[PDB]
Amino acid sequence: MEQLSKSVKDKVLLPCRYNSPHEDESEDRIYWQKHDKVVLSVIAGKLKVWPEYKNRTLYDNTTYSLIILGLVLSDRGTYSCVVQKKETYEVKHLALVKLSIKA
């Protein structure tokens, strides 16, 4: 569980911590989620950002990491980065990031 402390209005990069010789844009499905919400997905290399996060997030293609712009208090919490392969779903990678925020 990596932990980051930022302030309201900061931008932040949440590291997915994914790096293995089995990275494969074809099969790799990458998801960032927070609680019962999905932030974004990357399927076949194509990015899809959920409505709540459109215009306030970026994706770093190099590291599969999530960038959030203009933090607000409700952005606090645990985020997950998941790399899966659908065959049946199989998970290749799971990483958790705890974002703490104050004003």
From Swiss-Prot:
Disulfide bonds join C16-C81. Disruption phenotype: CD80-deletion mice have fewer T-follicular helper cells compared to WT, and residual T-follicular helper cells fail to mature. Expressed on activated B-cells, gamma interferon stimulated monocytes and non-circulating B-cell malignancies. Glycans are attached at N55, N61. It is found in: Cell membrane. Residues 2-95 form the Ig-like V-type domain. Costimulatory molecule that belongs to the immunoglobulin superfamily that plays an important role in T-lymphocyte activation. Acts as the primary auxiliary signal augmenting the MHC/TCR signal in naive T-cells together with the CD28 receptor which is constitutively expressed on the cell surface of T-cells. In turn, activates different signaling pathways such as NF-kappa-B or MAPK leading to the production of different cytokines. In addition, CD28/CD80 costimulatory signal stimulates glucose metabolism and ATP synthesis of T-cells by activating the PI3K/Akt signaling pathway. Homodimer. Interacts with CTLA4; this interaction inhibits T-cell activation. Interacts with PDL1/CD274; this interaction blocks PDL1/PDCD1 binding and thus PDL1 inhibitory function. Interacts with CD28. This is T-lymphocyte activation antigen CD80.
